[PDB]
């Protein structure tokens, strides 16, 4: 429980200290080891009956640790970290659903992961921004369907949807016309998914 | 978390074995000691960061333990256990809301408690039935408002409302005409409560 979280954050901080300003090829291996250590600790918290708030805490700590590795590195590494970050965010959201988490805690973790991806796209170039926008939209769809399965209200589902739609618009503001319509098609698909999830609710 | 539940259930079972068919007057004190021990363990699970499923398990175990004391006793004791059972269920529902539980788990615990009260009105007189229904309607309102605070959907909220309204109609069935209109006044007040929460 509380003992599992302390051991996990200690391993994450030590993993984060390594390969940070120490090599791109090593940072990718360290990040995959950081994401695996987080995934095992999340599954461990689920087995031992931990609160959803502890699960959110450990998950957010891991996502921010991956975020720091992606920023100070190249765009090739940033896309690799963002794919790892979104996959870890999926596992954490699935764990919260199995642990019986509230809609609000699912929204919090989802927003933390969406802002982290947005933080990578704004810092990078235009081709990277489109790659992050597609990753962000897929993760947003996963979170919206997790909220639906958890019993969330249309208010919170529409809330998480707007945050993801705003994040996609925020990427297009600092881009050319070619990037705008490449994000506009992503926005229409995410609005379609959000409309379907809300109609079932 | 898992360590707290095992110690609590062992205390509840031993407390239940005592005064089960064992004196009524002691059973009421044992039941108050039973609900007090469960309420302290539920607060303990919240402080140590326990999962909502562990809180539901311990709460349902305590509610059923009270249910056993109420059935093999008299109607006066059955009403006393039902008030204790409803108060404990309210604490457990609030603990679930503070712990970050899902709306489904809140609905599950609420239904367990509403059925436990209905089972006490079962095989009881009409005077006890009306007293149980008033307790059931109040606990139903508590659970519905907790569901709203937890971000529950209209489907889950309307589902819990249907269960509570159906439970009131089951009490009216096989009852006197004087009991039916007494339940009918309770049904209409729970209906507007559900409409206000659903809006």
Numbering used by the authors:
A (entry chain B): 1 to 201
B (entry chain A): 1 to 199
Q: What text appears in the publication on this structure?
A:
Here we describe extendable linear, curved and angled protein building blocks, as well as inter-block interactions, that conform to specified geometric standards; assemblies designed using these blocks inherit their extendability and regular interaction surfaces, enabling them to be expanded or contracted by varying the number of modules, and reinforced with secondary struts. We construct twistless helix repeat (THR) protein blocks from identical straight α-helices (typically 2–4 helices in each unit); the length of the blocks can be varied simply by varying the number of repeat units. Restricting helical geometry to ideal straight helices with zero helical twist in principle considerably limits what types of structure could be built, but this is more than compensated by the great simplification of downstream material design, as illustrated below. Using X-ray crystallography and electron microscopy, we validate nanomaterial designs ranging from simple polygonal and circular oligomers that can be concentrically nested, up to large polyhedral nanocages and unbounded straight ‘train track’ assemblies with reconfigurable sizes and geometries that can be readily blueprinted.
To generate straight, linear THRs, we set Δθ to zero. This results in perfectly straight repeat proteins in which each repeat unit is translated but not rotated relative to the previous unit. We tested 33 linear THRs (with Δh = 0) with helices either about 20 or about 40 residues in height; 23 of 33 tested designs were solubly expressed, and 13 of 19 designs analysed by SEC were primarily monomeric as designed. Structural characterization of the linear building blocks by X-ray crystallography individually and/or cryogenic EM (cryo-EM) in the context of assemblies (see below) revealed that both the detailed internal structures and the overall straight linear geometry were successfully achieved.
